[PDB]
Amino acid sequence: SVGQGEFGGAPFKRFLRGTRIVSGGKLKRMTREKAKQVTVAGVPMPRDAEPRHLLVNGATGTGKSVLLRELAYTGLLRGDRMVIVDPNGDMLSKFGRDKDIILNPYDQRTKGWSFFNEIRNDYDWQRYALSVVPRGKTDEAEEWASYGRLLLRETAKKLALIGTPSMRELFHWTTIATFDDLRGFLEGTLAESLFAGSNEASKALTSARFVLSDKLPEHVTMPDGDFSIRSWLEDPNGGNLFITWREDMGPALRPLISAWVDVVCTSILSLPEEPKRRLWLFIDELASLEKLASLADALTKGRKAGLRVVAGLQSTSQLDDVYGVKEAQTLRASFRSLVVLGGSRTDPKTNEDMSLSLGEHEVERDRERVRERVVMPAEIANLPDLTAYVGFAGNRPIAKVPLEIKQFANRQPAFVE
Amino acid sequence: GEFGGAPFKRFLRGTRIVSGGKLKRMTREKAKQVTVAGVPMPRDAEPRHLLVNGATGTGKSVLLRELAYTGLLRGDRMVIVDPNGDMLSKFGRDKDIILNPYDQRTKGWSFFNEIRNDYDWQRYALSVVPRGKTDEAEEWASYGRLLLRETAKKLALIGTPSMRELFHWTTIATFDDLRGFLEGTLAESLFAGSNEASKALTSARFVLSDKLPEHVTMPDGDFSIRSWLEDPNGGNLFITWREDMGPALRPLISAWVDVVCTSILSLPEEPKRRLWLFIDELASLEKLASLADALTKGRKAGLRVVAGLQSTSQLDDVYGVKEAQTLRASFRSLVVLGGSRTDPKTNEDMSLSLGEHEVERDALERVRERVVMPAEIANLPDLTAYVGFAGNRPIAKVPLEIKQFANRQPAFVEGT
Amino acid sequence: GEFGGAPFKRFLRGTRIVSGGKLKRMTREKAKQVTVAGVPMPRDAEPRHLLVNGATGTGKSVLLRELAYTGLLRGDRMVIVDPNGDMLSKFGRDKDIILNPYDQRTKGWSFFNEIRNDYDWQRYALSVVPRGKTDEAEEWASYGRLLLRETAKKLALIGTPSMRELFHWTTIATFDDLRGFLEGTLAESLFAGSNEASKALTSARFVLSDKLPEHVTMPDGDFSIRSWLEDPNGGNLFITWREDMGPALRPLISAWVDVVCTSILSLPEEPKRRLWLFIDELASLEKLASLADALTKGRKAGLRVVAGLQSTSQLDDVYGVKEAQTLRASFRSLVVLGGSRTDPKTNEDMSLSLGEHEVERDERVRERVVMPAEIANLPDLTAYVGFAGNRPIAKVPLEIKQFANRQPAFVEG
Amino acid sequence: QGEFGGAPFKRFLRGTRIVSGGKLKRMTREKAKQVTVAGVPMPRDAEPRHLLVNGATGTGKSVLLRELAYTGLLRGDRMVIVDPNGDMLSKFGRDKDIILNPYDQRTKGWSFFNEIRNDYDWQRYALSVVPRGKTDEAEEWASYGRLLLRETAKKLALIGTPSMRELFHWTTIATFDDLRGFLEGTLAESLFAGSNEASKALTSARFVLSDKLPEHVTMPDGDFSIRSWLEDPNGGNLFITWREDMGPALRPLISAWVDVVCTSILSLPEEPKRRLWLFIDELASLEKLASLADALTKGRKAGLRVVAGLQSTSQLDDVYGVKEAQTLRASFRSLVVLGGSRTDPKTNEDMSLSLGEHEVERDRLERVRERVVMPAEIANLPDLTAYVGFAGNRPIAKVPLEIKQFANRQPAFVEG
Ligand SMILES: Nc1ncnc2c1ncn2[C@@H]1O[C@H](COP(=O)(O)OP(=O)(O)O)[C@@H](O)[C@H]1O
Ligand SMILES: Nc1ncnc2c1ncn2[C@@H]1O[C@H](COP(=O)(O)OP(=O)(O)O)[C@@H](O)[C@H]1O
Ligand SMILES: Nc1ncnc2c1ncn2[C@@H]1O[C@H](COP(=O)(O)OP(=O)(O)O)[C@@H](O)[C@H]1O
Ligand SMILES: Nc1ncnc2c1ncn2[C@@H]1O[C@H](COP(=O)(O)OP(=O)(O)O)[C@@H](O)[C@H]1O
Ligand SMILES: [Mg+2]
Ligand SMILES: [Mg+2]
Ligand SMILES: [Mg+2]
Ligand SMILES: [Mg+2]
Structure with missing residues (x-):
């Protein structure tokens, strides 16, 4: 029948409506495009879905960082610019060049x-x-x-x-x-x-x-x-911006980092009319920043500027506690493409949200009409690390893909001074 | 054929779905009409208002621009809450008005x-x-x-x-x-x-x-929105602003929009009047003190409000649940452009709003089901919308065409 | 017979739906009656009050105007919260009273x-x-x-x-x-x-x-609403105002309506009295301190309240959920004019209010007599009438009757 | 079925899978030295993902944690033990080990x-x-x-x-x-x-x-420093003890020490071979820890392994708040359910739902979705019986918890 090696539930005779699930390879091929693309867990990302943003939800230790690092990497290969909220300067030590910028009050290389x-x-x-x-x-x-x-x-x-x-x-x-x-x-x-x-x-x-x-x-x-994030955005020849900090000082630098990220958010709304621009905003953990005053508008009016936001998230309860339920809902709804890396079984609520987010499908089976979740909350709770459900924005099927741990040479020190 | 679920033998009650073309035929009327995603809008539904709900980048703006355009062809007057002066640069004429503290062409x-x-x-x-x-x-x-x-x-x-x-x-x-x-x-x-x-x-x-x-x-x-509403020969009003100053002009724009709202309630008895109020994003304004009454008593004035909306959670956060519910309930006609899958609540609301139907299938069996599943709304490709006009009419899934409009005027003119 | 769902073999329990004409026959009575969407209203249901819920532009006003009219034909007295003096310009006589700080004809x-x-x-x-x-x-x-x-x-x-x-x-x-x-x-x-x-x-x-x-x-x-209520020969009271001043006169109108509410509780023992209180939009007034008691202890005074309502969310926001529930519960007879599809909650409430029925088919089934979707698809001027007590509901067409303007609506002071 | 409490089935489709105690023991067994959870060898990779042991009072949380601690010591790992009445101290405490208790003569300054x-x-x-x-x-x-x-x-x-x-x-x-x-x-x-x-x-x-x-x-x-102590490999294990009757009095001090360990590990130098366990007998008995969250999320590099006991989910909620408590719980990838009281159906429901459902195929063929473990099943568990559900893609199993006896190689308390 249908739904084998693809759909986790019982195979079915005919698909009626709802969320479609397809095999990893089938999606890769289906989403493959002519122009150069970036990849999400090895799946080429639809060009039009880039400025619609991506939300990577997943339990601690499942691969959000691996996924974002790969996305950033392929983005760099295409030559796109980006601002990376980079913990411990990990991304910096891997893709940081000399023309690139560093913002960290405690790093010797920081701009003023x-x-x-x-x-x-x-x-x-x-x-x-x-x-x-x-x-x-x-x-x-x-x-x-x-x-x-x-x-x-x-x-x-x-x-x-x-x-x-x-x-x-x-x-x-x-x-x-x-x-x-x-x-x-x-x-x-x-x-x-x-x-x-x-x-x-x-x-x-x-x-x-x-x-x-x-x-x-x-x-x-x-x-x-005299460094200015605004001017930097306008300078094409400007490099990439790495916002780094050492984990033990995270709470201390929370308000400063939240300021820089917000600055980028309002500032892109002033950049001049330029279709060819492509600027990524990588936020490892959206819930670890403060309630950003401009994130919302950026996620909604940043298309002209070519703003592409990619944010990691562990529990939906976090974002809720930071922005508040109503506001957090709107924030999330602004990310059109979703990636689910499977969470902990001690948190059935998130697993339910993710399951519901992935959606149900109406199917026709033998012995007949059934509505069911394409991915059960339990299925998400049992995902092994480095395994993710990829659901790009729009009318495209989701797929369960393996996330590969690519190795990157340390072409620069993460922290200095 | 047009219903996404399993085909059925017989329809009993509830929301009925029909093909795009079939609805276009059904809603077509003798008089000149305006269009919603290429569907002629029933005349009587115009002053009942239209709410266009849709995820960011799905076509709300395309839809509103088309509505505005066909409205202009019919010669109706309108007030357009216009971001970046987009509508202004496309349909703005010389007899038309501009309200923007930073645009040289603004009235005082x-x-x-x-x-x-x-x-x-x-x-x-x-x-x-x-x-x-x-x-x-x-x-x-x-x-x-x-x-x-x-x-x-x-x-x-x-x-x-x-x-x-x-x-x-x-x-x-x-x-x-x-x-x-x-x-x-x-x-x-x-x-x-x-x-x-x-x-x-x-x-x-x-x-x-x-x-x-x-x-x-x-x-x-000495410009007066009140006087302007009374002057038939007056043009259309374009309220513009540059996006980067949105938060700064929020309270001013919210004032102008509200002024229009109370003011129409004082206009003299005139059946032939047709005034549209285009609000690109209802949730981006403040809690308007007069919007409610305007949406309820603006019929005599011929007030027609069309508002865009992304998340129901926004309006809620601005007006408050109880109050936002009443606000939404005031828009009799609905358009659903499909939202993000990261927000299953709105998809559920939209699904429930579109309604269920009771059907007879295959001897036979009876089934109650959503005409449009939350998942179906989450999978809509951009520029695709469900059109559900007010009253007893079926809904339909229609394609939104991106029409091109020549820029017959600059969007912004730096006032120095 | 006449229901929207699949036909059934036998009716077991719950809300029963009947054809417009059949209800009209059923509710018809010997004495003179008033009509709700062309359906003669049971006499005993009058002092149990009527709540007319319906989306903007569906006919609440048409319905209330008809009710008022047939009520006047029977010679009953009434207090009408009348916007733009519409009811005044239609049924206002010379012996009738007008309360409006800006109308020249207003009493002091x-x-x-x-x-x-x-x-x-x-x-x-x-x-x-x-x-x-x-x-x-x-x-x-x-x-x-x-x-x-x-x-x-x-x-x-x-x-x-x-x-x-x-x-x-x-x-x-x-x-x-x-x-x-x-x-x-x-x-x-x-x-x-x-x-x-x-x-x-x-x-x-x-x-x-x-x-x-x-x-x-x-x-x-020196006009006194109290005295006026006691004077049989007194006319009808028209509380009017221009819509653009609605918010400004909200606290005053709310006061007059409330005054009527407490005051009727003092009127002397009179069984033959019949006083209607027409409130076009219950949610547009303030939180009335006496409406509740009036709706509960106004029988002996012969108080009959008819109120219009658009969203249940409104009343809630004004009186608060708990309180609003009690208020609504006080109106025994209900009329549902179909609302907007953008508000599925109200449609659900109205559907649930109309009730379910248990039926035998093909076979045992419990189902809403009127689906939320059915209420969201009602064309204007079409309503479900569910009188208080043990009577079936019916979907009836509301006719737009024309009334000659026998008096100006407003006369600037 | 022998493992599944419900009706036996023909074929398993998806969801949570249950297996026999012995079968899981085989499955999770590994080459390197491991620690055990109710006699089940714990997957090495699951150690730094933390373990949450939920169970009614008197069901075995302490027995389970004591066994875990013990096997951990046999492997030579270091650990910080929030130890009530110095029970763990009197059993596994050595001379090179540290004691923090303002009222015990052996305490460091x-x-x-x-x-x-x-x-x-x-x-x-x-x-x-x-x-x-x-x-x-x-x-x-x-x-x-x-x-x-x-x-x-x-x-x-x-x-x-x-x-x-x-x-x-x-x-x-x-x-x-x-x-x-x-x-x-x-x-x-x-x-x-x-x-x-x-x-x-x-x-x-x-x-x-x-x-x-x-x-x-x-x-x-x-001059004792928990920071320095963490850096000294030759340092022993840290026992934070107190007498129960003084629990409320020492609540804020113990909460400070536990939190200190939490932030401090985040500063330890790059060392893959490190293995530090944080045993918290009752997570809800401490205050709202400012660093527990980050520790549970960024402690992998330091090799932090947290194991916490918990009775009611309502407790943690009352301390951290629902939203925050949800995030906290979600940070513990591996779960152990010891069965609770029947007077608290909510927790039994949570635990049941946490254990998950499964979709199965049975002979009257029929498809069924059902909880692998019913709330009632959890409410009927006899003491010393637990459901073990390790993090990741592994089946859960109902295993018997054995009460191992440990010689008292040191006094629990020594008044000062
Ligand atoms: N350099 C690496 N070498 C090997 N495994 C790695 C590496 N980086 C990440 N991983 C794998 O990814 C898992 C999750 O960590 P990470 O990818 O950073 O995501 P998360 O955002 O959930 O912390 C680790 O448990 C490990 O299996
Ligand atoms: N002038 C245009 N040229 C090409 N595509 C356009 C144009 N205007 C709108 N679109 C399309 O419509 C989508 C939705 O954006 P828009 O119409 O502004 O509605 P929304 O209010 O949902 O943002 C865009 O992603 C794009 O695909
Ligand atoms: N005098 C009239 N002329 C034509 N249509 C009218 C007239 N009065 C009412 N109607 C009709 O009745 C509908 C309801 O308006 P109204 O009776 O004021 O009730 P409401 O505004 O409370 O729903 C309008 O949609 C219109 O179709
Ligand atoms: N030293 C012991 N001797 C005998 N039984 C014990 C001993 N320690 C624990 N137990 C058993 O374990 C049960 C649960 O107590 P405990 O292991 O402290 O867990 P908890 O209090 O966390 O539920 C006791 O009722 C008893 O049956
Ligand atoms: Mg990470
Ligand atoms: Mg738009
Ligand atoms: Mg009315
Ligand atoms: Mg214990």
């Missing part, structure tokens, strides 16, 4: 940077204050955040105005200077009266201080330079 | 220009300061509107209806000075006498400091 | 006109200041009512029952002056002695500053 | 100061001393506490007096003003001053530290 370097028009202040101070986890936390951005944008605006665009100065005024002195320095800015006149006003200012005291730190200790 | 505007009676102050304060996301956020908003309407009312009274002055008093003037300026207005005592009163005033300041900005930097003029 | 009114005993102050303060949407909003509301009832009580006492004065003291007079004016009232100490006390007073001010406005600008007069 | 090596380490371990708050508001306080803790400790260390006593005095005894004074010069200088909110925040911090610090202060002094 400050969010000031991205300001070009007045609307840019709030725009990037949104990157420095990501969205709050809760409504109340976001209210504080907003106060923090008000304080940040007005204080930075003035410092820049009087010719001293210093993060050190910015940090001093917003978190060290006494309450009165700050209010004084604010006189003349839109924040002049907003932060005064009532207890509420003072409370709000106090909230702002705390927020900025939490976010700014790593921004301040960042080696200075 | 201030919400003052819409005030005609006393009840109009709160009415449009409701537009300048949209509804709060949360109950607490709305409470602040209300304080903001109180502060806004009373301060503007006085400014207008003393003959200085300036947004600059309004912005100065409500966000720059010291607390005391403001209280002073308020003396004589209904807001005189409301914002004084206790900590709570002061807190409320502080809340109002913040809100207005968030909304007003783009209103202030807006080029001044 | 103030809630003072309803006060007759001491318990009436809070009673109508509950009408002027409807229930809060959220618990916190209601807490403020309560402070507002305290401030409202005590200030009004004193103004009436010293002989100056003025809404203008009431509004001045409660929202314009400085904090201290107000406290001063309160001295002697129960509100004397309640609003003083701590920050909390002061905060509460501030809350009250805001609330009244939101509700009172339209009450103040209302043309003064 | 410790202070979190001993773990600081770089500047980013202050917050890093402040996160260990002050675990995550149960609720969002509780965590906000906690964060203030960490700010106060890290800045005060940083200064104390700076001026040469890294004393927990001094730290505790300044943060919870010194008058408000004096503290603010001592803070002058630190990042916390202005943060905790200038408004009521600021003062409120400081008050919150005080309370938090006053709750956590206590046991840290009364801890015998020393």
